[PDB]
Amino acid sequence: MELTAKPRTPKQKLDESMIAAVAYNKENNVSFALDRKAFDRAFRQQSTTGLFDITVEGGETFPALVKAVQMDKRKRAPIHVDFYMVTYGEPVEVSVPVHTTGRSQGEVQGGLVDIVVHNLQIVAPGPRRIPQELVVDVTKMNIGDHITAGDIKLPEGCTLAADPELTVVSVLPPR
Amino acid sequence: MSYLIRKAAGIGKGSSTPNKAKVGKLNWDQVLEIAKTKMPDLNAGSVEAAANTVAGTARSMGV
Amino acid sequence: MKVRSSVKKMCDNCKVVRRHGRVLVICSNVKHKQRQG
Amino acid sequence: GKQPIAVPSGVTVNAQDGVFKVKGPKGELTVPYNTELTVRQDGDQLLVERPSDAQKHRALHGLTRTLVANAVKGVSDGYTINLELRGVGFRAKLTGKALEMNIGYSHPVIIEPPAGVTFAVPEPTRIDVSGIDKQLVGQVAANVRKVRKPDAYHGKGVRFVGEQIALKAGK
Amino acid sequence: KRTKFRKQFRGRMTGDAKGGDYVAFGDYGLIAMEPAWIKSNQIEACRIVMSRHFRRGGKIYIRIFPDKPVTKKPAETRMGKGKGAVEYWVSVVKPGRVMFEVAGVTEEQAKEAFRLAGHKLPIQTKMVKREVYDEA
RNA sequence: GGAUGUGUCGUCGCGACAGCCAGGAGGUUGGCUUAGAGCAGCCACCCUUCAAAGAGUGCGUAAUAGCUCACUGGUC
RNA sequence: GAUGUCGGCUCGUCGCAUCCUGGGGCUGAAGAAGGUCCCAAGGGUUGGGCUGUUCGCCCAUUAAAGCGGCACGCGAGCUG
Ligand SMILES: [Mg+2]
Numbered sequence: 001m002e003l004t005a006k007p008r009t010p011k012q013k014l015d016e017s018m019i020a021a022v023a024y025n026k027e028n029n030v031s032f033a034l035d036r037k038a039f040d041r042a043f044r045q046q047s048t049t050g051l052f053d054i055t056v057e058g059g060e061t062f063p064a065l066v067k068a069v070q071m072d073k074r075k076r077a078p079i080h081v082d083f084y085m086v087t088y089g090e091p092v093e094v095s096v097p098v099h100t101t102g103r104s105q106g107e108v109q110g111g112l113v114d115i116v117v118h119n120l121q122i123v124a125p126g127p128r129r130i131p132q133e134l135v136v137d138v139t140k141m142n143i144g145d146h147i148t149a150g151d152i153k154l155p156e157g158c159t160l161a162a163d164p165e166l167t168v169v170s171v172l173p174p175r
Numbered sequence: 176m177s178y179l180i181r182k183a184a185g186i187g188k189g190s191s192t193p194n195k196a197k198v199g200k201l202n203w204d205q206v207l208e209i210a211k212t213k214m215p216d217l218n219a220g221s222v223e224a225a226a227n228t229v230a231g232t233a234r235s236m237g238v
Numbered sequence: 239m240k241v242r243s244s245v246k247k248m249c250d251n252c253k254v255v256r257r258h259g260r261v262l263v264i265c266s267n268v269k270h271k272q273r274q275g
Numbered sequence: 276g277k278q279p280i281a282v283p284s285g286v287t288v289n290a291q292d293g294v295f296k297v298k299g300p301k302g303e304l305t306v307p308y309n310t311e312l313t314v315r316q317d318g319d320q321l322l323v324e325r326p327s328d329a330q331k332h333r334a335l336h337g338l339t340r341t342l343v344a345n346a347v348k349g350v351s352d353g354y355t356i357n358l359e360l361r362g363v364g365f366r367a368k369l370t371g372k373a374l375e376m377n378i379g380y381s382h383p384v385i386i387e388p389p390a391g392v393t394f395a396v397p398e399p400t401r402i403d404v405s406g407i408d409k410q411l412v413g414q415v416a417a418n419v420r421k422v423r424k425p426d427a428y429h430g431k432g433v434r435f436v437g438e439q440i441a442l443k444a445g446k
Numbered sequence: 447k448r449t450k451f452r453k454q455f456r457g458r459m460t461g462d463a464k465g466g467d468y469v470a471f472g473d474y475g476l477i478a479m480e481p482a483w484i485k486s487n488q489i490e491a492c493r494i495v496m497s498r499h500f501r502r503g504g505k506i507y508i509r510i511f512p513d514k515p516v517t518k519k520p521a522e523t524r525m526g527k528g529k530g531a532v533e534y535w536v537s538v539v540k541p542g543r544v545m546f547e548v549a550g551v552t553e554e555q556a557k558e559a560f561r562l563a564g565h566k567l568p569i570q571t572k573m574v575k576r577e578v579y580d581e582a
Numbered sequence: 583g584g585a586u587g588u589g590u591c592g593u594c595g596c597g598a599c600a601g602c603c604a605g606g607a608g609g610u611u612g613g614c615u616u617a618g619a620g621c622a623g624c625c626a627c628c629c630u631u632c633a634a635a636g637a638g639u640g641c642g643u644a645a646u647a648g649c650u651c652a653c654u655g656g657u658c
Numbered sequence: 659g660a661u662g663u664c665g666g667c668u669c670g671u672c673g674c675a676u677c678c679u680g681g682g683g684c685u686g687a688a689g690a691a692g693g694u695c696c697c698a699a700g701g702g703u704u705g706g707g708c709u710g711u712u713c714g715c716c717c718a719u720u721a722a723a724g725c726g727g728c729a730c731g732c733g734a735g736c737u738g
């Protein structure tokens with residue numbers, strides 16, 4: 001993403017393929033303005049658990065991590081994006097999404113595996129080593145089995161945020 | 176081969192739901208006689224591949 | 239011949255043909271002769 | 276898209292103005308086309324080029340390429356569609372050069388050919404439509420087929436060669 | 447469908463979407479693209495229909511409960527006040543409000559259920575996919 | 583609502599693709615439900631041979647068959 | 659300081675969501691006899707019993723016994 005202009009008047013952004021965004025941490029709060037296509041292709045991969053090189057016009061590579069993204073309504077195309085400069089030891093609480101691998105021993109019996117909470121926020125992600133995904137064992141589940149956060153293997157060097165007894169995934173009964 | 180399995184494991188009919196409640200369970204020895212009687216009906220080429228052929232039938236039957 | 243305001247496919251033989259300002263559909267199966275006009 | 280075009284000695288292509296006259300041993304046939312659509316005989320064979328490459332031009336490209344091939348094959352060997360008379364009591368005679376129908380109808384249907392098309396009977400139970408212009412040959416033979424459309428129970432009337440006509444059946 | 451207890455009457459006003467989100471409580475969702483009034487009965491229309499296409503699962507969520515009573519004309523005349531207390535309940539819906547959402551099933555199995563449960567609706571709709579992460 | 587009507591931006595993947603000649607499984611009549619085999623519905627969608635034929639798409643019969651596609655080679 | 663009200667009789671005309679006559683597609687259309695849909699207002703669309711009836715039921719027939727409008731057409735035209 002070769003960031004360039006960064007004014008306060010979006011008059012030179014809206015007609016063209018550009019999207020407004022801002023990056024900050026504490027010391028510097030300079031408003032930005034990245035490209036549409038550039039972001040709609042990067043954010044699809046790293047989402048909010050992956051940092052990407054942000055070089056401003058002139059030669060300034062600043063590492064940042066997507067925080068929150070407001071979405072334009074009525075249209076899938078986003079309109080504003082928030083970034084957060086990576087600190088290096090402790091910076092902010094990052095949300096990590098929960099996937100599912102391997103067929104359960106409940107899906108076959110008749111039931112169906114349903115994820116209660118798709119995105120699971122943790123405490124202290126640790127820079128340089130942000131968990132971009134999270135693999136949870138689901139095969140050990142049968143009919144009515146509830147797998148909380150106290151059952152999910154840690155990335156390493158990271159801690160949970162939600163209630164230890166909060167059901168993340170559960171196999172619902174058929175029909 | 177289904178008729179042979181229903182006589183060996185002593186299966187009366189089968190299983191409407193092979194995903195919840197199965198039937199019985201046999202051994203590989205009973206498979207040996209099956210691939211030995213229905214040889215003209217089998218290609219499969221030596222040994223195991225014929226052995227793995229019958230397995231696929233019992234798997235979707237409830238054995 | 240069945241006149242339907244919503245002429246869509248029904249098999250893998252229905253072929254939409256744009257003639258003189260009309261939406262038609264030719265098909266081996268004669269019961270699949272839909273035409274908006 | 277189509278570029279190959281079979282040209283042989285017996286034909287004569289004349290790209291004069293908008294009227295593309297073509298001569299042959301079977302008879303001279305005229306086939307008009309467009310002016311913007313470039314076309315000429317380059318070297319030995321004939322090529323049909325097009326100004327622009329979208330649809331309004333490509334749609335006419337293959338169009339002309341084929342029609343010219345039809346005039347060539349028409350003046351070289353000629354077209355002859357072979358029909359068939361299938362059914363009970365179905366037959367056809369000949370009166371000089373006009374085809375005489377006789378299929379179920381109380382009164383025989385007389386079909387007279389236009390200028391340039393000639394009928395032929397091998398058989399009481401076969402029809403043969405010969406002509407020069409490939410369009411006329413079809414346009415004429417067709418009329419013959421319209422006389423009695425193959426019914427979806429016995430497949431009577433007139434057909435081609437063998438037509439594939441599956442029977443629905445009563446019953 | 448219908449509320450268990452309320453005041454009774456109401457009014458009428460349509461502003462832009464407020465509390466509608468791209469995805470939650472499942473993987474696929476169905477969003478409106480025109481403001482209108484979604485009758486209770488229309489919701490039964492959609493729900494039942496999607497249950498015909500889904501033998502088992504029960505993973506069909508409907509978080510657009512109607513909370514809007516509407517009046518009606520009893521016979522004729524105009525010499526009277528509030529007419530027709532009990533008619534039907536309608537749930538307001540603005541472009542970008544998620545009405546329906548399913549999961550467990552595939553892609554094709556979802557393009558049918560929303561489709562079908564789309565022809566009943568007074569308005570147009572489009573089916574979306576995941577890649578939204580606002581609040582949680 | 584529907585559609586190979588066009589113009590202009592985007593997102594997925596591919597010696598093709600369409601056509602033409604040829605081949606098409608052996609386990610198998612899969613297990614099951616019923617008066618009763620790719621194609622009413624429950625369940626799976628496993629193995630082998632191979633340059634290769636997915637227990638499977640549509641039409642069909644009371645079931646059968648048959649006619650084809652997905653997959654392979656050749657000719658442009 | 660007035661736009662005469664229902665029905666009937668009389669006299670017509672018009673539209674097409676066609677009652678029957680014509681020209682087609684499909685059919686669980688063999689044929690015959692139908693169903694349904696598309697095109698088409700040229701012409702036709704009966705006589706009686708009960709009721710003020712408009713409707714409707716019934717008798718006897720017919721290819722058919724269409725559905726609306728024209729101030730629910732028409733009272734300086736008639737009945738009342
Ligand atoms: Mg007066």
Ligand SMILES: [Mg+2]
Pocket residue numbers: none
């Ligand atoms: Mg009409």
Ligand SMILES: [Mg+2]
Pocket residue numbers: none
């Ligand atoms: Mg008949």
Ligand SMILES: [Mg+2]
Pocket residue numbers: none
């Ligand atoms: Mg009288």
Ligand SMILES: [Mg+2]
Pocket residue numbers: 729
């Ligand atoms: Mg009047």
